[PDB]
Amino acid sequence: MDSDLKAKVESCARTADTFTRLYYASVDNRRQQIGRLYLDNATLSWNGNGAIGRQMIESYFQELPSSNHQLNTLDAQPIVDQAVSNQLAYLIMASGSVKFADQQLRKFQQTFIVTAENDKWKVVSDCYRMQE
Amino acid sequence: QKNFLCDTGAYELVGAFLENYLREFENDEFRHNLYKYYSENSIFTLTCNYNVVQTPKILQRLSKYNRHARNLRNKDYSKASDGVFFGCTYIVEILLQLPRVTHDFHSLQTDVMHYNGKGAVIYVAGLLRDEPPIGGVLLGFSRQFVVTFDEANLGLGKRARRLKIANERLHITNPSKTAIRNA
């Protein structure tokens, strides 16, 4: 396709990989600092249970059992201008398996939308779904 | 089963868009008629995370999705375009090669994540049956849609919204024992 769309898709793929790597290491290994990755006013939806704004997101995570995530699938699209213009946005899914403390092993799909504060990418939305 | 709702104004857009779009994807014969939702700037990817565990049957049926699937986990950043379908013609072209399905509408979990006058972000998690033109296959799936709202220009000067899909991902995966139980 167009050599600039190629550049936009490829840039997005690198960001999505850097972000998800660090994100999934923060939830498993440093949940104390998990809030730092959300915008002040982000939406979280953990299995259809909403948490709006970091303060409230940041206390959902502190009340969740300890976790270990195995990633297997990563996907990122750059978001079309009209969906949210003047802020370039990435639509990232991560899927795999997760082991919560004192719970059966499960599968998960996590779908973020991220934008940039300065040089750092943070969550605008996050939809988490467990399966097994 | 819990559904998330952004805004209570978005409520009857779940049934209107998601449950009409899904029903019309179902029969692959009339699936070309989804050309209307997509635009010149539309983007579609397909991901497949199905752990195989009737093994030859499974792998030949899942290949229908896999042959188009995209995954950047451990991939070389140059091949990042591999799997990305761009523009209405190209998207509908991939969508017409996928198998026939029947979604289990009772199984569907909804997450509306944004909603305004410009548009919405809407995710569905559910169970569908993959059907052959050989045997039936239950699959897990996710569909995520970034959609925009544009004033339809019928001639009556009454404001109306046409839905367009800007971003689109189908995800194929294992059904959960609970869904299989209750299909």
CSV table of all heavy atoms in Angstrom, one decimal, chain B residues 20-67:
chain,number,residue,atom,x,y,z
B,20,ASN,N,-27.3,-6.0,14.0
B,20,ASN,CA,-27.7,-6.0,12.6
B,20,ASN,C,-26.4,-6.4,11.7
B,20,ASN,O,-26.5,-7.4,10.9
B,20,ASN,CB,-28.3,-4.7,12.1
B,20,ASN,CG,-29.7,-4.6,12.5
B,20,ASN,OD1,-30.5,-5.5,12.6
B,20,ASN,ND2,-30.1,-3.3,12.8
B,21,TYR,N,-25.3,-5.8,12.0
B,21,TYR,CA,-24.0,-6.1,11.3
B,21,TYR,C,-23.6,-7.6,11.5
B,21,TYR,O,-23.2,-8.2,10.5
B,21,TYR,CB,-22.9,-5.2,12.0
B,21,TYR,CG,-21.6,-5.6,11.4
B,21,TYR,CD1,-21.0,-4.9,10.3
B,21,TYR,CD2,-20.9,-6.7,11.7
B,21,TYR,CE1,-19.9,-5.2,9.7
B,21,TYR,CE2,-19.7,-7.1,11.1
B,21,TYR,CZ,-19.2,-6.4,10.1
B,21,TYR,OH,-18.0,-6.8,9.5
B,22,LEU,N,-23.7,-8.1,12.7
B,22,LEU,CA,-23.4,-9.5,13.0
B,22,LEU,C,-24.3,-10.4,12.2
B,22,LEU,O,-23.8,-11.3,11.5
B,22,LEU,CB,-23.5,-9.8,14.5
B,22,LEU,CG,-22.2,-9.8,15.3
B,22,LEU,CD1,-21.1,-8.9,14.7
B,22,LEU,CD2,-22.4,-9.4,16.7
B,23,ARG,N,-25.6,-10.2,12.2
B,23,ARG,CA,-26.6,-11.0,11.5
B,23,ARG,C,-26.3,-11.0,10.0
B,23,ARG,O,-26.5,-12.0,9.4
B,23,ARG,CB,-28.0,-10.6,11.8
B,23,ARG,CG,-28.7,-11.3,13.0
B,23,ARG,CD,-29.9,-10.5,13.4
B,23,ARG,NE,-30.4,-10.9,14.7
B,23,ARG,CZ,-30.6,-10.2,15.8
B,23,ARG,NH1,-30.3,-8.9,15.8
B,23,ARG,NH2,-31.1,-10.7,16.9
B,24,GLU,N,-25.8,-9.9,9.5
B,24,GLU,CA,-25.6,-9.7,8.0
B,24,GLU,C,-24.2,-10.3,7.6
B,24,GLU,O,-24.1,-10.5,6.4
B,24,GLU,CB,-25.7,-8.3,7.6
B,24,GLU,CG,-25.8,-8.0,6.1
B,24,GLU,CD,-26.4,-6.7,5.8
B,24,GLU,OE1,-26.8,-5.9,6.7
B,24,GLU,OE2,-26.6,-6.4,4.6
B,25,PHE,N,-23.3,-10.4,8.5
B,25,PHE,CA,-22.0,-11.1,8.2
B,25,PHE,C,-22.2,-12.6,8.1
B,25,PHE,O,-21.6,-13.2,7.3
B,25,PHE,CB,-21.0,-10.8,9.4
B,25,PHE,CG,-19.6,-11.4,9.1
B,25,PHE,CD1,-18.7,-10.8,8.3
B,25,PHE,CD2,-19.3,-12.6,9.7
B,25,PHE,CE1,-17.4,-11.4,8.1
B,25,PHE,CE2,-18.0,-13.2,9.5
B,25,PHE,CZ,-17.1,-12.6,8.7
B,26,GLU,N,-23.2,-13.1,8.9
B,26,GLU,CA,-23.5,-14.5,9.1
B,26,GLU,C,-23.5,-15.3,7.7
B,26,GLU,O,-22.6,-16.2,7.6
B,26,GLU,CB,-24.8,-14.7,9.8
B,26,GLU,CG,-24.7,-14.4,11.3
B,26,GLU,CD,-25.7,-15.0,12.3
B,26,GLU,OE1,-26.7,-15.5,11.8
B,26,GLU,OE2,-25.4,-14.9,13.5
B,27,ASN,N,-24.4,-15.0,6.8
B,27,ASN,CA,-24.5,-15.7,5.5
B,27,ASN,C,-23.5,-15.1,4.6
B,27,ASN,O,-23.7,-13.9,4.2
B,27,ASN,CB,-26.0,-15.7,5.0
B,27,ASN,CG,-26.1,-16.5,3.8
B,27,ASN,OD1,-25.2,-16.9,3.1
B,27,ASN,ND2,-27.4,-16.8,3.5
B,28,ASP,N,-22.5,-15.8,4.2
B,28,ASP,CA,-21.4,-15.4,3.3
B,28,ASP,C,-21.8,-15.1,1.9
B,28,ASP,O,-21.1,-14.3,1.2
B,28,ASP,CB,-20.2,-16.4,3.3
B,28,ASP,CG,-20.6,-17.9,3.0
B,28,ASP,OD1,-21.8,-18.2,3.3
B,28,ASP,OD2,-19.7,-18.6,2.5
B,29,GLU,N,-23.0,-15.6,1.5
B,29,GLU,CA,-23.6,-15.3,0.2
B,29,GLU,C,-24.0,-13.8,0.0
B,29,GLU,O,-23.9,-13.3,-1.1
B,29,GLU,CB,-24.9,-16.2,0.0
B,29,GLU,CG,-24.6,-17.4,-0.9
B,29,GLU,CD,-26.0,-18.0,-1.4
B,29,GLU,OE1,-26.6,-18.8,-0.6
B,29,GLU,OE2,-26.4,-17.7,-2.5
B,30,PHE,N,-24.5,-13.2,1.1
B,30,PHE,CA,-25.0,-11.8,1.0
B,30,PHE,C,-24.0,-10.9,1.9
B,30,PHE,O,-24.4,-9.8,2.2
B,30,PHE,CB,-26.4,-11.8,1.5
B,30,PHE,CG,-27.3,-12.7,0.8
B,30,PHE,CD1,-27.9,-13.8,1.4
B,30,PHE,CD2,-27.5,-12.6,-0.6
B,30,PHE,CE1,-28.6,-14.8,0.7
B,30,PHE,CE2,-28.3,-13.6,-1.3
B,30,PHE,CZ,-28.8,-14.6,-0.6
B,31,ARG,N,-22.8,-11.4,2.1
B,31,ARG,CA,-21.8,-10.7,3.0
B,31,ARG,C,-21.2,-9.5,2.3
B,31,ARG,O,-20.7,-8.6,3.0
B,31,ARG,CB,-20.8,-11.7,3.5
B,31,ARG,CG,-19.9,-11.1,4.5
B,31,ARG,CD,-18.9,-12.2,4.9
B,31,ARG,NE,-19.4,-13.3,5.6
B,31,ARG,CZ,-18.8,-14.4,5.8
B,31,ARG,NH1,-17.6,-14.6,5.3
B,31,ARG,NH2,-19.4,-15.4,6.5
B,32,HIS,N,-21.2,-9.5,1.0
B,32,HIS,CA,-20.7,-8.4,0.1
B,32,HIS,C,-21.5,-7.1,0.5
B,32,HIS,O,-20.9,-6.0,0.3
B,32,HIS,CB,-20.9,-8.6,-1.4
B,32,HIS,CG,-22.3,-8.9,-1.8
B,32,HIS,ND1,-23.0,-10.1,-1.6
B,32,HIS,CD2,-23.2,-8.1,-2.5
B,32,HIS,CE1,-24.2,-10.0,-2.2
B,32,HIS,NE2,-24.3,-8.8,-2.7
B,33,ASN,N,-22.7,-7.2,1.1
B,33,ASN,CA,-23.6,-6.0,1.4
B,33,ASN,C,-23.1,-5.3,2.6
B,33,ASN,O,-23.8,-4.3,3.0
B,33,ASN,CB,-25.0,-6.5,1.6
B,33,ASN,CG,-25.7,-6.8,0.2
B,33,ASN,OD1,-25.6,-6.1,-0.7
B,33,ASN,ND2,-26.4,-8.0,0.2
B,34,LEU,N,-22.0,-5.7,3.2
B,34,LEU,CA,-21.4,-4.9,4.3
B,34,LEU,C,-20.5,-3.8,3.7
B,34,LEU,O,-19.8,-3.1,4.5
B,34,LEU,CB,-20.6,-5.8,5.2
B,34,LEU,CG,-21.3,-7.0,5.8
B,34,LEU,CD1,-20.4,-8.0,6.4
B,34,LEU,CD2,-22.4,-6.5,6.8
B,35,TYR,N,-20.4,-3.7,2.4
B,35,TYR,CA,-19.6,-2.7,1.7
B,35,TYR,C,-19.9,-1.3,2.2
B,35,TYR,O,-19.1,-0.5,2.2
B,35,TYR,CB,-19.7,-2.9,0.1
B,35,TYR,CG,-18.8,-1.9,-0.6
B,35,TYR,CD1,-17.4,-2.0,-0.7
B,35,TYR,CD2,-19.3,-0.8,-1.3
B,35,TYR,CE1,-16.6,-1.1,-1.3
B,35,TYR,CE2,-18.5,0.1,-2.0
B,35,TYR,CZ,-17.2,-0.1,-2.0
B,35,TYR,OH,-16.4,0.8,-2.7
B,36,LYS,N,-21.2,-1.2,2.6
B,36,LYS,CA,-21.8,0.2,3.0
B,36,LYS,C,-21.1,0.7,4.3
B,36,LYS,O,-21.1,1.9,4.4
B,36,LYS,CB,-23.3,0.1,3.2
B,36,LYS,CG,-23.7,-1.0,4.2
B,36,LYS,CD,-25.2,-0.8,4.6
B,36,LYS,CE,-25.8,-2.1,5.0
B,36,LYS,NZ,-27.3,-2.1,4.9
B,37,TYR,N,-20.6,-0.1,5.2
B,37,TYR,CA,-20.1,0.4,6.5
B,37,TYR,C,-18.7,0.9,6.3
B,37,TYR,O,-18.3,1.7,7.2
B,37,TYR,CB,-20.0,-0.7,7.5
B,37,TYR,CG,-21.3,-1.3,7.9
B,37,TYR,CD1,-21.7,-2.6,7.5
B,37,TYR,CD2,-22.2,-0.7,8.8
B,37,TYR,CE1,-22.9,-3.2,7.8
B,37,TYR,CE2,-23.4,-1.3,9.2
B,37,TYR,CZ,-23.7,-2.6,8.7
B,37,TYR,OH,-24.9,-3.2,9.0
B,38,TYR,N,-18.0,0.4,5.3
B,38,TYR,CA,-16.5,0.6,5.2
B,38,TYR,C,-16.3,1.8,4.3
B,38,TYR,O,-17.2,2.3,3.6
B,38,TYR,CB,-15.8,-0.7,4.8
B,38,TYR,CG,-15.9,-1.8,5.8
B,38,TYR,CD1,-16.9,-2.7,5.9
B,38,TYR,CD2,-14.9,-1.8,6.8
B,38,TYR,CE1,-17.0,-3.7,6.9
B,38,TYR,CE2,-14.9,-2.8,7.8
B,38,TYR,CZ,-16.0,-3.7,7.8
B,38,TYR,OH,-16.0,-4.7,8.8
B,39,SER,N,-15.1,2.4,4.4
B,39,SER,CA,-14.8,3.6,3.6
B,39,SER,C,-13.4,3.4,3.0
B,39,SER,O,-12.8,2.4,3.3
B,39,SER,CB,-14.9,4.8,4.5
B,39,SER,OG,-13.6,5.0,5.1
B,40,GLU,N,-12.9,4.4,2.3
B,40,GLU,CA,-11.7,4.4,1.5
B,40,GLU,C,-10.5,4.2,2.5
B,40,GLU,O,-9.4,3.7,2.1
B,40,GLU,CB,-11.6,5.6,0.6
B,40,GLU,CG,-12.9,5.9,-0.2
B,40,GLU,CD,-14.2,6.4,0.4
B,40,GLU,OE1,-14.3,6.4,1.7
B,40,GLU,OE2,-15.0,6.9,-0.4
B,41,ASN,N,-10.7,4.7,3.7
B,41,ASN,CA,-9.6,4.9,4.7
B,41,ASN,C,-9.7,3.8,5.8
B,41,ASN,O,-8.9,3.9,6.8
B,41,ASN,CB,-9.6,6.3,5.4
B,41,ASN,CG,-8.9,7.3,4.5
B,41,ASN,OD1,-7.9,7.0,3.9
B,41,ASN,ND2,-9.5,8.5,4.5
B,42,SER,N,-10.7,2.9,5.7
B,42,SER,CA,-10.9,1.8,6.7
B,42,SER,C,-9.7,0.8,6.8
B,42,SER,O,-9.0,0.7,5.8
B,42,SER,CB,-12.2,1.0,6.3
B,42,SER,OG,-13.3,1.6,6.9
B,43,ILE,N,-9.6,0.2,8.0
B,43,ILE,CA,-8.5,-0.7,8.3
B,43,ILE,C,-9.1,-1.9,9.1
B,43,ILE,O,-9.9,-1.7,10.0
B,43,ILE,CB,-7.4,0.0,9.2
B,43,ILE,CG1,-6.8,1.1,8.5
B,43,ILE,CG2,-6.4,-1.1,9.7
B,43,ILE,CD1,-5.4,1.6,9.0
B,44,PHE,N,-8.7,-3.1,8.6
B,44,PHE,CA,-9.2,-4.4,9.2
B,44,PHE,C,-8.0,-5.4,9.4
B,44,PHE,O,-7.2,-5.5,8.5
B,44,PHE,CB,-10.2,-5.0,8.2
B,44,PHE,CG,-10.6,-6.4,8.6
B,44,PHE,CD1,-11.6,-6.5,9.6
B,44,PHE,CD2,-10.0,-7.5,8.2
B,44,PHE,CE1,-12.0,-7.8,10.1
B,44,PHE,CE2,-10.4,-8.8,8.6
B,44,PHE,CZ,-11.4,-8.9,9.6
B,45,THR,N,-7.9,-6.0,10.6
B,45,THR,CA,-7.0,-7.1,10.9
B,45,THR,C,-7.8,-8.2,11.5
B,45,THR,O,-8.9,-8.0,11.9
B,45,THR,CB,-5.8,-6.7,11.7
B,45,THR,OG1,-6.2,-6.4,13.1
B,45,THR,CG2,-5.0,-5.5,11.2
B,46,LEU,N,-7.2,-9.4,11.4
B,46,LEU,CA,-7.8,-10.7,11.9
B,46,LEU,C,-6.7,-11.4,12.7
B,46,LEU,O,-5.5,-11.5,12.2
B,46,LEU,CB,-8.2,-11.5,10.7
B,46,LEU,CG,-8.9,-12.8,10.9
B,46,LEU,CD1,-9.8,-13.1,9.7
B,46,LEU,CD2,-8.0,-13.9,11.2
B,47,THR,N,-7.0,-11.9,13.9
B,47,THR,CA,-6.0,-12.5,14.8
B,47,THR,C,-6.6,-13.8,15.2
B,47,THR,O,-7.8,-13.9,15.2
B,47,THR,CB,-5.7,-11.5,15.9
B,47,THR,OG1,-6.8,-11.5,16.9
B,47,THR,CG2,-5.5,-10.1,15.5
B,48,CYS,N,-5.8,-14.8,15.4
B,48,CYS,CA,-6.2,-16.2,15.7
B,48,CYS,C,-5.3,-16.8,16.8
B,48,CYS,O,-4.1,-16.9,16.6
B,48,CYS,CB,-6.1,-17.1,14.4
B,48,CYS,SG,-7.3,-18.5,14.6
B,49,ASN,N,-5.9,-17.1,17.9
B,49,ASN,CA,-5.2,-17.5,19.2
B,49,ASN,C,-5.8,-18.8,19.6
B,49,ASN,O,-6.0,-19.0,20.8
B,49,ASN,CB,-5.3,-16.5,20.3
B,49,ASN,CG,-4.4,-16.8,21.5
B,49,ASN,OD1,-4.1,-15.9,22.3
B,49,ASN,ND2,-3.9,-18.0,21.5
B,50,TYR,N,-6.1,-19.7,18.7
B,50,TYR,CA,-6.8,-21.0,19.0
B,50,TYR,C,-5.8,-22.1,19.2
B,50,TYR,O,-5.1,-22.6,18.3
B,50,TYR,CB,-7.8,-21.3,17.8
B,50,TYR,CG,-8.7,-22.5,18.1
B,50,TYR,CD1,-9.9,-22.4,18.6
B,50,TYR,CD2,-8.2,-23.8,17.9
B,50,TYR,CE1,-10.8,-23.5,18.8
B,50,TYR,CE2,-9.0,-24.9,18.1
B,50,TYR,CZ,-10.3,-24.7,18.6
B,50,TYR,OH,-11.1,-25.8,18.8
B,51,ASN,N,-5.6,-22.5,20.5
B,51,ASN,CA,-4.9,-23.7,20.9
B,51,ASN,C,-5.6,-24.9,20.3
B,51,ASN,O,-6.7,-25.3,20.8
B,51,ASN,CB,-4.7,-23.8,22.4
B,51,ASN,CG,-4.2,-22.6,23.1
B,51,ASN,OD1,-5.0,-21.7,23.4
B,51,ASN,ND2,-3.0,-22.5,23.5
B,52,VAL,N,-5.0,-25.6,19.3
B,52,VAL,CA,-5.5,-26.9,18.8
B,52,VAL,C,-5.3,-27.9,20.0
B,52,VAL,O,-4.2,-27.8,20.7
B,52,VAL,CB,-4.8,-27.3,17.5
B,52,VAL,CG1,-5.4,-28.6,17.0
B,52,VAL,CG2,-4.9,-26.2,16.5
B,53,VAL,N,-6.2,-28.8,20.2
B,53,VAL,CA,-6.1,-29.9,21.2
B,53,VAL,C,-6.9,-31.1,20.7
B,53,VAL,O,-6.4,-32.2,20.8
B,53,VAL,CB,-6.6,-29.4,22.6
B,53,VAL,CG1,-8.0,-28.8,22.6
B,53,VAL,CG2,-6.6,-30.6,23.6
B,54,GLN,N,-9.8,-34.6,17.2
B,54,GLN,CA,-10.3,-34.5,15.8
B,54,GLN,C,-9.3,-33.5,15.0
B,54,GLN,O,-9.8,-32.7,14.2
B,54,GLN,CB,-11.7,-34.0,15.8
B,54,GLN,CG,-12.6,-34.8,14.8
B,54,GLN,CD,-14.0,-34.4,14.8
B,54,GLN,OE1,-14.7,-34.1,15.8
B,54,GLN,NE2,-14.6,-34.3,13.6
B,55,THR,N,-8.0,-33.6,15.3
B,55,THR,CA,-7.0,-32.6,15.1
B,55,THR,C,-6.9,-32.2,13.6
B,55,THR,O,-6.8,-31.0,13.3
B,55,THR,CB,-5.6,-33.0,15.7
B,55,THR,OG1,-5.8,-33.1,17.1
B,55,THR,CG2,-4.5,-32.1,15.4
B,56,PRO,N,-6.8,-33.1,12.6
B,56,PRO,CA,-6.7,-32.7,11.2
B,56,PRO,C,-7.9,-31.8,10.8
B,56,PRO,O,-7.7,-30.8,10.0
B,56,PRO,CB,-6.7,-34.0,10.4
B,56,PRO,CG,-7.1,-35.1,11.4
B,56,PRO,CD,-6.7,-34.6,12.8
B,57,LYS,N,-9.1,-32.1,11.2
B,57,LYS,CA,-10.4,-31.3,11.0
B,57,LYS,C,-10.2,-29.9,11.5
B,57,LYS,O,-10.4,-29.0,10.7
B,57,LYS,CB,-11.6,-31.9,11.7
B,57,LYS,CG,-12.9,-31.5,11.1
B,57,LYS,CD,-14.1,-31.7,12.0
B,57,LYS,CE,-15.4,-31.9,11.3
B,57,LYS,NZ,-15.4,-33.2,10.6
B,58,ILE,N,-9.8,-29.8,12.7
B,58,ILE,CA,-9.6,-28.5,13.4
B,58,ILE,C,-8.7,-27.6,12.6
B,58,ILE,O,-9.1,-26.5,12.1
B,58,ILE,CB,-9.1,-28.6,14.9
B,58,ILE,CG1,-10.1,-29.4,15.7
B,58,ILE,CG2,-8.9,-27.3,15.5
B,58,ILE,CD1,-11.6,-29.0,15.6
B,59,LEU,N,-7.5,-28.1,12.3
B,59,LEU,CA,-6.4,-27.3,11.7
B,59,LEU,C,-6.7,-26.9,10.2
B,59,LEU,O,-6.3,-25.8,9.8
B,59,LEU,CB,-5.1,-28.2,11.6
B,59,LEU,CG,-4.2,-28.1,12.9
B,59,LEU,CD1,-3.1,-29.1,12.8
B,59,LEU,CD2,-3.8,-26.7,13.2
B,60,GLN,N,-7.5,-27.7,9.5
B,60,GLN,CA,-7.9,-27.4,8.1
B,60,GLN,C,-9.0,-26.3,8.2
B,60,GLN,O,-9.0,-25.4,7.3
B,60,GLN,CB,-8.4,-28.6,7.3
B,60,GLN,CG,-9.5,-29.4,7.9
B,60,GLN,CD,-10.5,-30.0,6.9
B,60,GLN,OE1,-11.1,-29.4,6.1
B,60,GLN,NE2,-10.6,-31.3,7.1
B,61,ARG,N,-9.9,-26.3,9.2
B,61,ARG,CA,-11.0,-25.4,9.3
B,61,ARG,C,-10.5,-24.0,9.8
B,61,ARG,O,-11.0,-23.0,9.4
B,61,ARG,CB,-12.1,-25.9,10.3
B,61,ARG,CG,-12.8,-27.2,9.8
B,61,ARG,CD,-13.8,-26.9,8.7
B,61,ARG,NE,-14.9,-26.1,9.1
B,61,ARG,CZ,-16.1,-26.6,9.4
B,61,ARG,NH1,-16.4,-27.8,9.3
B,61,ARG,NH2,-17.1,-25.7,9.9
B,62,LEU,N,-9.6,-24.0,10.8
B,62,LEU,CA,-9.0,-22.8,11.4
B,62,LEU,C,-8.0,-22.1,10.5
B,62,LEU,O,-7.7,-20.9,10.7
B,62,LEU,CB,-8.2,-23.2,12.7
B,62,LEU,CG,-8.9,-23.3,14.0
B,62,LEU,CD1,-8.0,-23.6,15.1
B,62,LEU,CD2,-9.6,-21.9,14.2
B,63,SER,N,-7.5,-22.8,9.5
B,63,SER,CA,-6.6,-22.3,8.4
B,63,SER,C,-7.4,-21.2,7.6
B,63,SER,O,-6.8,-20.3,7.0
B,63,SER,CB,-6.0,-23.4,7.5
B,63,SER,OG,-7.0,-24.0,6.8
B,64,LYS,N,-8.8,-21.3,7.5
B,64,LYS,CA,-9.6,-20.4,6.8
B,64,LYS,C,-9.4,-19.0,7.3
B,64,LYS,O,-9.5,-18.0,6.5
B,64,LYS,CB,-11.1,-20.8,6.9
B,64,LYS,CG,-11.4,-22.2,6.4
B,64,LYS,CD,-11.3,-22.4,4.9
B,64,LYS,CE,-11.6,-23.8,4.4
B,64,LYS,NZ,-10.8,-24.1,3.2
B,65,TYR,N,-9.2,-18.9,8.6
B,65,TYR,CA,-8.9,-17.6,9.4
B,65,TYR,C,-7.4,-17.4,9.4
B,65,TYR,O,-7.0,-16.2,9.0
B,65,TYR,CB,-9.4,-17.7,10.8
B,65,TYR,CG,-10.9,-17.9,10.9
B,65,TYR,CD1,-11.4,-19.2,11.1
B,65,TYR,CD2,-11.8,-16.9,10.7
B,65,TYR,CE1,-12.8,-19.4,11.2
B,65,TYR,CE2,-13.2,-17.1,10.8
B,65,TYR,CZ,-13.6,-18.4,11.0
B,65,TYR,OH,-15.0,-18.6,11.1
B,66,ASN,N,-6.6,-18.4,9.7
B,66,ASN,CA,-5.2,-18.3,9.9
B,66,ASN,C,-4.5,-17.8,8.6
B,66,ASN,O,-3.5,-17.0,8.8
B,66,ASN,CB,-4.5,-19.6,10.3
B,66,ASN,CG,-4.3,-19.7,11.8
B,66,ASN,OD1,-3.6,-18.9,12.3
B,66,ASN,ND2,-4.9,-20.7,12.5
B,67,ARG,N,-4.9,-18.2,7.5
B,67,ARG,CA,-4.2,-17.8,6.2
B,67,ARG,C,-4.2,-16.3,6.0
B,67,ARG,O,-3.4,-15.8,5.2
B,67,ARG,CB,-4.8,-18.5,5.0
B,67,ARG,CG,-6.3,-18.2,4.8
B,67,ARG,CD,-6.7,-18.5,3.4
B,67,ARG,NE,-6.4,-19.9,3.0
B,67,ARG,CZ,-7.3,-20.8,2.6
B,67,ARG,NH1,-8.6,-20.5,2.5
B,67,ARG,NH2,-6.9,-22.0,2.3
